[PDB]
Amino acid sequence: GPNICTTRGVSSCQQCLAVSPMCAWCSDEALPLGSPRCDLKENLLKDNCAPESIEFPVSEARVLEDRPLSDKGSQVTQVSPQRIALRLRPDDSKNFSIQVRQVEDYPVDIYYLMDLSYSMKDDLWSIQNLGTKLATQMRKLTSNLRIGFGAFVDKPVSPYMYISPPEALENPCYDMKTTCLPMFGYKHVLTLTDQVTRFNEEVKKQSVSRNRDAPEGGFDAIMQATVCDEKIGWRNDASHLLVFTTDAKTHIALDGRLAGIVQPNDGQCHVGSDNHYSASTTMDYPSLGLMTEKLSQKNINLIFAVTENVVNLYQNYSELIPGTTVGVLSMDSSNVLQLIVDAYGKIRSKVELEVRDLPEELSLSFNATCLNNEVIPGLKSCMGLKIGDTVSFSIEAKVRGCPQEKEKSFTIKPVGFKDSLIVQVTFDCDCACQAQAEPNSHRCNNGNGTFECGVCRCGPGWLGSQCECSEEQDECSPREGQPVCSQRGECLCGQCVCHSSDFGKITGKYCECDDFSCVRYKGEMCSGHGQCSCGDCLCDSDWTGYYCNCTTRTDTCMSSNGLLCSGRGKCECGSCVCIQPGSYGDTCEKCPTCPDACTFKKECVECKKFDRGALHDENTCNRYCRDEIESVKELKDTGKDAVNCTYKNEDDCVVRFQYYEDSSGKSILYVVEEPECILVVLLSVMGAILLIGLAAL
Amino acid sequence: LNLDPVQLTFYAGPNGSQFGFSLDFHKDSHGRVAIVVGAPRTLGPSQEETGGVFLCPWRAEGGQCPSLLFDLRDETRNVGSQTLQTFKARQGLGASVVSWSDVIVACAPWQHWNVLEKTEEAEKTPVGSCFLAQPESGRRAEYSPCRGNTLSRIYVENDFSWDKRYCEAGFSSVVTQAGELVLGAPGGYYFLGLLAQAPVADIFSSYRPGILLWHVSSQSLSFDSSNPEYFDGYWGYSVAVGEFDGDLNTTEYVVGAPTWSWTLGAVEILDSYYQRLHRLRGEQMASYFGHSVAVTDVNGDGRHDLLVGAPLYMESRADRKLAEVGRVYLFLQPRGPHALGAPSLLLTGTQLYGRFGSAIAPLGDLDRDGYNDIAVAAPYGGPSGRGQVLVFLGQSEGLRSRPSQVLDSPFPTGSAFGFSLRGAVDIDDNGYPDLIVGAYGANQVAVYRAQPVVKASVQLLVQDSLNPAVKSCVLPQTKTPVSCFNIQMCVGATGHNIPQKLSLNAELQLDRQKPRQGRRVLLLGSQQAGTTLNLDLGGKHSPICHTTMAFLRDEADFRDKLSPIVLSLNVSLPPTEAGMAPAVVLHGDTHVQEQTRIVLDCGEDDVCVPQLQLTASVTGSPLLVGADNVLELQMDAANEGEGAYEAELAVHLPQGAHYMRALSNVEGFERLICNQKKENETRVVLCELGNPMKKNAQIGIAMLVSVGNLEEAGESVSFQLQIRSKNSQNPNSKIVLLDVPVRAEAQVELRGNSFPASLVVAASWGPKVEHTYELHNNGPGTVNGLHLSIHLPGQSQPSDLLYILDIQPQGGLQCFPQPPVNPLKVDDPVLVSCDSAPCTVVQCDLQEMARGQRAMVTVLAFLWLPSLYQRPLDQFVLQSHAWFNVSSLPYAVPPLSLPRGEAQVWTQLLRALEERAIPIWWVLVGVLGGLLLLTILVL
C-alpha cells in the first residue's frame, strides 16, 4: 500500500527520484489521472505505464580498467580494479571491492637516516660495513635493491651549540682532547644507487659532532629526506624504506622559540647543490602533522631504530604516524641488520587503505575479508599476512543528497604502495521529462501555463494548484477530526501549501513532516554525522544507531591479538565491551582467573600433529593455533619460565610438553620428541578358550 | 562580541622589525593610557639587530611610534681577575614589555654573559635581562636575576648542579599588584626552568650605574631536582599569577611546562615559596600543553579559573587519520581545596595547521554582562590561511563552545596575525575594554575598539482570545462596527555609555503565517497588515511602552476559525548612513512572537475554562551519587474542562539533571517537542502537550531524564511538575512534588584457578598453586574498611603434602596466617581441604577500593613430595575455601550487603599409572600358545 515514495513527492520527477533510491518515475501521458505517477518500479509495471516511459536510474560501479593482479615483480599491479566509474542516485549507495595483493620480488629502496651526535660515536663503527651485508640478506626477498645514507645532529644556533671560546665554533669538543666536526643540521651523502659498494665506502668518511642539550634535531631530516625526492632518488615503482636511528628525544615544532627562530616550517625542499639544509637556522621544527602528511604523500615507510631508554617514547609516537614500526636497537647497532629485515617483514604483513581527497558528501565503510573467509565488519585493515597473500575488502559508498558539481574523484590505496584505485564518481540527479520541458502557455492561468511532465507549476506569488483558485477545495488532513495540514500548512485549491521557516523547509504531502526536528547530540541534529530525513536520522554509512553516535568503525576495538575485543569480548559503538568474567582493561586484554593457555588450546598436538578430533572438517584447525613444533631434549628448565603440562595422548602415553612464552611471546614448542609411557571380559575370553579346548579334547 | 572590525587603527613600525611580538598597556600618572609595543630585531646604533621598545601614544589615525631609549653599548668591566662581559647583540629586547603603575619592564630574553678569568671561561650563554624604564625622567634600572660568575670546571665537576647559565630570564613576566616581578626562564637549571622574583622598589633602589653583577637583597629563585619527568620540560615557558588557596594576602603562581614528562606537558599551580599545589597533565603527546596560560574568572563566581592552550593538538577526521587543528582547555575552580576535575570545556580548531590557542588573553567584560570573556587566536587559521582571532563569551557553566566572533586578518599571508594579544584595559575612555593584536610578519598592530552594547528587551501583551461577536470599535472614515482588540508592545534598551540620540525601528506583523490577501487581523490606523514606527528612546533607561489598536475582519472575508492568529515583533537598528560605521551593536531578544486565536466551543462563558489534572510517577527510584543515572518519568495529563489553549508541561529540573528524550502515547507525535529554558533561576524544560486539548482529552507522556551528579542534592530530591496554559482562569495544574530518595553498594567478584588447573603427578621446590581471589570492585562508589577472613587448609607445617608460601597482594595487607606460613622460608581423591584436613584462619584486610578497583591475593606454593607420597595408588584432590566481609564503607548508608561468598579453588591431581587390562591386544598371543600346544599334541 502506502510507501515512502507516494507520501512525499508526486509534483516533480526530480523530487520523486531524490526521496528514496527505490522510487522511479513514469512520464507516460497516456496514464489516466488519479494514479500515483511516482511509485515503485514493480508497481509501475503493475500500473501498466509504458516501459519506455519508465526511467529507473540504477547506481552501478562500472569497472573500467581490470588488468589482472601481477604474480611476480619482474607491469606490476597490486590493486584491482584500478579505475571504477560510479553513478550514485540521491541518498543512494552501492558497493565495490578492491583486491589488494602484496607481490613478491618487488624492488626495495633503503635510506639510512643515522644520527651523528657525540653519544653515537660508537655507532659509526658498526654501520661501516652495512649495505653489502644488507644486500646478501635482502637478495632472498628482492632482486632490485638500492641504498642511501644521511645524517643530522641539530640546529646550528646559540642555545644548542657552543659559541665560546672562538676556537670552539669549528671544534665543538674543544675542552676534551678530540676533534669533532662542526655542527650541522643535515648533510645528505648518498643518492639511492643499485650499487652497494658506495654505502660501504662513504660511511668510512663521516664523523661526529657535539650539541649541548640532549634532544637531537631529528624531525628536520625526516622532512628533507621525504620531500627532496629528486635528490634522494626515490623510484616510482619500488618499496620506500626510511631507517631512522636515534639515541634520545627529538625536537618538535615550537621548540625553536628558545633560540629566536619563530618561522613555521613550510615543508618544501631546501637542500641546495651542496647537500645541506640551508634554512636550518632560519626555520622552525616541523610538527607531527606535517611529517605524517609528507610521508603519506610520498609513499614512505619509516622504521625507528631507537634504544632502550627512548623506546617507550618512540613506540608512543608511532601510534600517531600510520605505516611505521619501532625497534629496540643496541647501544652500538650490533643488531641493525636484523632489525631492518624484521621491520620489512612486519610492514609487509598488513594492508591498510587510506582514502585521499574524499568529497565532503561521501562516507566509506569497509568489511575486511582476509585469510580464510573471516569477514570482520568495520575494520579496513588486517594483520597476519605473509608476502604473497591476497586480501579482498568490501567498501560501501553513500552520497548525502546530489551535490552541485557532478564529477569528483578520490583514491583508495594501501599505504606505502604506488598502485591505487581511482574512483570517478558521477552523481545522477537528473530526469528525462523535465530536461525536454517547454512553457506550454494557456494550459493553466491566463496564458501562463508552465512546463511539461503533467504539472503547470504556477508562478511564485500566484495562488492556485493548477492556477485554478486564489481565495475561494477538499479535505487536507489524514483524519477528519485532525487539524488541516497539521496546523503547519494552508489548504488552498485542495493542496497543503505550507510555510517557510528559518530553521528549514517543511516537507510532505500535507507537510506534517519536519526536516529539522531530529534529535541532536550537543548542538546539531543527527550528531553531525547524518541528515534529518523526515524526523528520523539517516546516519552516514559509517555510523549507526537511533542517534548518529555509535560508529561502526572497529579500529578502536582492535588489539595485537587479531580479534575484535580480543577473544574474550565484543565491541559496540567503537568501544570494547568486556564479556568474559573477570576481564578488564583498555580493550579487554586482561581476563585473569581464566584457564591458562596451556589448558585449553592443546588440540594443536591433536588436530595438527597426529590429526584427530574436531577441526578436521572445520577450516579453523590452524587459523588460531599456529604454534611452531620444536623438539628440544630435556633442558635444565623443568618449569621456571613457562607452563609445561602433560596429558595422556590417543595411545594413553604421557607426553611432557611445554608451550607458553620465552620472550614476550613465543608460539614455539619446547616439547620432547620422545615421550615416556578387566576380569569379566578376561574371564569370558578364558571360558570360551577353555570350552574351545574342551571341544578339542 | 562588539570588536568593530570595519574601522581599525594600524600602528606601523620599521621594516624588518617584528613590532608586535609582544604588547602591553601603560597608564601614566595623568591618565593618558599609551601602548607599549615590543619590537625585536629593530636594528640599533651600529647596524646590528638588538630589538627595541616603542612607546606608542593613543591617536585615532595611528602611525609611527616615538620609541623608548634603552642603553645598548656592550658593557665590560673588571671586578677583579674577572672580566665580566655582556654582549648586547641579537637580543629580543621587546619580546615581553609588561608594565606597572609607573614602570616599564621590557625584557631581552637572549642576552649573553661571559666572565673571563685568566684562561678559564664561563662560556657565552643566553642569560637574559629585564630593562626597567620609567617615564618622567626616570632611571634605566636593569634586573638580571641569574647573572653568575662561576667557571665551567665547577659546573662540570658538580654534575651541572644549579646551572643558571641558560635562563633566558625574560621569556615570561608578570608584575603582581603588590609590586613583585616574577620572570620565567625555561632554560634554567639545564633546561628544567626556574622563576625569579624581586620587588620593584628593591631593584630600583639597588641599581648602580655601570654595575653589572650585583645580588638583589630580597630575591628568590625556584628550586629543581633530579625527577626524570622534569628533564627538558621548559618549566617557565609561560607564567601567570592568581589567587587559589583562599588567603588573599598570600599569592599563588601558575606555570606552564610544555614539554614536561617526555613531550606530554603540564601546567602547575604554585605558592609564593615555590611549593606545588596541583599539576594538570596534557591529553596527547606532542600537543604542547601549557604553551600559553591565562588566569581569569569566566563563570563570575569570584574564584579565578584557568585556561591552558595546546596549539599542536591532532584530531581525527574522515579522510585524515590525524589532523593538526589545536585545542584549548578550560578548568573551573571548585569550591574548597578540592582537586581540580576534568577539563570543563574543550575548544578545538577547524583549519589545518591553524595553531589555534597559541595566545590566550583575558578580555575583561567586553559585553559588560558580569561574565568575563576571553579571546583565543589562530595565527595561521582561517579559510585562506592568513590569520584569525576568535572571541568567546563566558557563562555560568563556563565558556561557549561556539566562537561569538571571528576577526579575519587584514594583513597578507605570512603575517602571523594574532600571535600576541592584550586587553581588559580601556584605551579611549569609552567604558569598554579594547583589544590590541599584533602581526610580526607585517610589522603592524591592529587596535580593535569595542563598541557599546545595547541590551534590548521586548514583550508583547495581547489578549489570550478574541471574540468576533462583540463590536466595540468602528472603522476609520466609516460607521462600520468592528471587533477591535488591544496590542501592547514594550521595547526596552539598557546600556552603559550609549548615545543620547538612539533610534530603533519596531516592525509589527499581524497574522504572520497567512498570505497578504488572507490576513484576518488588520491594523485600525493604516489599514495595513504590517507597520513600522520609529522609536526615540535616547536617554530613557526604563523601557518605553507604546500601544495600538487592531480589529478582526468581516465573517465572509475569512473561512478559518481554528488556525491561531500569530503576531510578531522585530526591533532592528536603522541602517548605517553614508560612511558606514554603525554606532552600536544590538543584542538580546531582538524578536518575540505571541499567538492568539478565535474563541471556539468554550460554552456559555465564551472563555475556555480549563480543568487540568496531573498525576505523576517515577520509575527507577534508586538514585546513586556519583553515577550517570537515568530517570524515566510517567505522567498522565487529562483536561476535564473546556479547551486548554497552549497547554504545556513544566518540569522543574535541578542544576544536575538534563533532558534527553520523550515519547507520547498517541501516535501523533510520540517524540514530543521539548525545549529547555535556562532563563529561570533553575533549569526548566518546556515539553509541548497540544494547542489546544479538546474536552476530556487524556494524554500520557513518557519522560526520560538523565539525572546528573549532584553531591549537595541530599537524602531526597523533590521534583516539581506542573501544566502551564495561557488561559485567564485557572491556567495551571496542581503542583506535584515528587520526592526521590537517594542511596550506595560494593560488589566484589571472586574466582580462582591453579597453575596448572588440571595436573597429573608422579606415581627442592614443587609446583605452585594459586587461589587468585581478586577483589574486582564492581561497586558504584569508593569503599573504605574492607577486611577479609579466609579459611585455608593446613597449618603451614612440614607434615602436610604442600608448603603454603607467602602471597603477592597490591596494598596495605598484614594478615599473619595462623600459624604463620613459611615457618621456614623458601622462595582415589584424598581431599586436602579445610573440612577434612586442618584449617587455617587467614585474615588479610584492605581499606580503599574506588568504583571498579580490584587487586587480589596470589597463593605461591611448592608441594611437599613425601607427605602426599602416601596412598601408593590414590590420586589426590586439593581443595581450598575462602570467606570475606566488610567492616564499614564511606557512605551515608551501605544498606545492601557486607560482601560474602564462598569458593573452592581445586587443584585436581591424577595418577598417571595403570597396569594392562582389555583382553584384546594379547588375545592373538593366547591363540598362538594354543596353536603351539595343538602342534605338540599332533606330533
Ligand SMILES: *[C@@H]1O[C@H](CO)[C@@H](O[C@@H]2O[C@H](CO)[C@@H](O[C@@H]3O[C@H](CO[C@@H]4O[C@H](CO)[C@@H](O)[C@H](O)[C@@H]4O)[C@@H](O)[C@H](O[C@H]4O[C@H](CO)[C@@H](O)[C@H](O)[C@@H]4O)[C@@H]3O)[C@H](O)[C@H]2NC(C)=O)[C@H](O)[C@H]1NC(C)=O
Ligand atoms: C607512552 O606509553 C604509554 C601510553 O600511555 C605511557 O607510559 C606510561 O607512563 C605514565 C607515567 O609513568 C603512566 O601514567 C601513570 O600510570 C600509573 C599506573 O597506572 C596504573 O597503576 C596502578 C597502580 O599504581 C595499577 O593498578 C593500574 O592497573 C595501572 O597500571 C597511574 O597510577 C598514574 O596515575 C597518574 O595519573 C592520573 C591522571 O590520569 C592522576 O590522577 C594520578 O594522580 C597520577 O598522577 C599515571 O596514569 C602510564 O599509565 C603509562 N602507561 C601505562 C598504561 O602503563 C605514556 O603515555 C607514554 N610513555 C612515555 C615514556 O611517555
Ligand SMILES: *[C@@H]1O[C@H](CO)[C@@H](O[C@@H]2O[C@H](CO)[C@@H](O[C@@H]3O[C@H](CO)[C@@H](O)[C@H](O)[C@@H]3O)[C@H](O)[C@H]2NC(C)=O)[C@H](O)[C@H]1NC(C)=O
Ligand atoms: C558489512 O558487513 C555487515 C555485516 O552484517 C553488513 O551489514 C549487514 O549486511 C547484511 C547483508 O546485506 C544485511 O542483511 C540484509 O539487510 C537488508 C536490509 O538492510 C535486508 O533487506 C536483507 O534481507 C538482509 O536482512 C544486514 O541487515 C546488515 N546489517 C545492518 C544492521 O546494516 C554490511 O552491509 C556490510 N557492508 C559492506 C560494506 O558490505
Ligand SMILES: *[C@@H]1O[C@H](CO)[C@@H](O[C@@H]2O[C@H](CO)[C@@H](O)[C@H](O)[C@H]2NC(C)=O)[C@H](O)[C@H]1NC(C)=O
Ligand atoms: C555488492 O553487494 C552485494 C550484496 O552483498 C553482493 O551480492 C550480490 O550483489 C550483486 C549486485 O550488487 C547481485 O547481482 C547478486 O545477486 C548479489 N548476491 C548476493 C549474495 O546477494 C555483491 O557481490 C557485491 N559486489 C558487487 C560489486 O555487486
Ligand SMILES: *[C@H]1O[C@H](CO)[C@@H](O[C@@H]2O[C@H](CO)[C@@H](O)[C@H](O)[C@H]2NC(C)=O)[C@H](O)[C@H]1NC(C)=O
Ligand atoms: C551516543 O550518545 C548518546 C547521547 O547523545 C547516548 O545516549 C544513551 O541513551 C540511552 C537511552 O537508553 C542510555 O541508556 C545510554 O546510557 C546513553 N548513553 C550511553 C552511555 O550509552 C548513546 O548511548 C551513545 N551511544 C553509545 C555510547 O552507545
Ligand SMILES: *[C@@H]1O[C@H](CO)[C@@H](O)[C@H](O)[C@H]1NC(C)=O
Ligand atoms: C619594506 O617596506 C616596503 C614599503 O616601503 C614594503 O613593500 C616591503 O614589503 C617591506 N619589507 C622589506 C624588508 O622589503
Ligand SMILES: *[C@@H]1O[C@H](CO)[C@@H](O)[C@H](O)[C@H]1NC(C)=O
Ligand atoms: C592575612 O590573611 C589572613 C587570613 O585572611 C588575615 O586574617 C590577615 O589579617 C591577613 N593579613 C593582612 C594584614 O593582610
Ligand SMILES: *[C@@H]1O[C@H](CO)[C@@H](O)[C@H](O)[C@H]1NC(C)=O
Ligand atoms: C528581523 O530583522 C532582521 C534583520 O534583517 C532579520 O534578520 C530577522 O530575521 C527579522 N526577524 C523577523 C521575524 O522579521
Ligand SMILES: [Ca+2]
Ligand atoms: Ca652510542
Ligand SMILES: [Ca+2]
Ligand atoms: Ca641537541
Ligand SMILES: [Ca+2]
Ligand atoms: Ca593566596
Ligand SMILES: [Ca+2]
Ligand atoms: Ca571561576
Ligand SMILES: [Ca+2]
Ligand atoms: Ca561577557
Ligand SMILES: [Ca+2]
Ligand atoms: Ca575602549
Ligand SMILES: [Ca+2]
Ligand atoms: Ca462556556
Ligand SMILES: [Mg+2]
Ligand atoms: Mg645524542
